[PDB]
Write a protein that binds this ligand. Sequence first.
Ligand SMILES: [Zn+2]
Length: 205
Amino acid sequence: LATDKDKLSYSIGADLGKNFKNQGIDVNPEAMAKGMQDAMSGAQLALTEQQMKDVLNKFQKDLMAKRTAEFNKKADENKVKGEAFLTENKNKPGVVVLPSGLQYKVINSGNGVKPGKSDTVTVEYTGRLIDGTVFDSTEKTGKPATFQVSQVIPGWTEALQLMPAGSTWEIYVPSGLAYGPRSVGGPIGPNETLIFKIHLISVKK
Ligand SMILES: [Zn+2]
């Protein structure tokens, strides 16, 4: 690895190898080097245009199926844990279960007004997963957040309309009232039940 050409080639290969290994793709680097050399020298490829196209389409299809099965398995695993968590939590002191499946516990009751669907609210909050992983919070920005009541996840919309201004609640949000069966790879996987501590500061008609 003395030249910049060798170092670049190696770095690309290592990036590829790490990506393949991370996806469980069993690959033969020598056979791949040979096909790469053949393509670049202008030689006759050891496979026809069609054999290769068939090979790579079978490859993609298997990958999607594998990725889909991992999604569904994770979606089901999170649903199961969520239902387990909520079934245990409904028994605990102070926990109220609402018709939509949203649960909450009043930590402190305010005396202000309850926001309506159209109002805007200012709130402090922390959102966490069932394992305690915090995925968001106003306590980094050290500044209240502001939201229209109708433009947040349904669990918040249902909770806020019950909350007097000044109140602090913990709410326990079934995935159907949060982000449902979705994963953009972010901190929230599919069918995740969420827990929020929400302090409602003010309501704005
Ligand atoms: Zn409702």
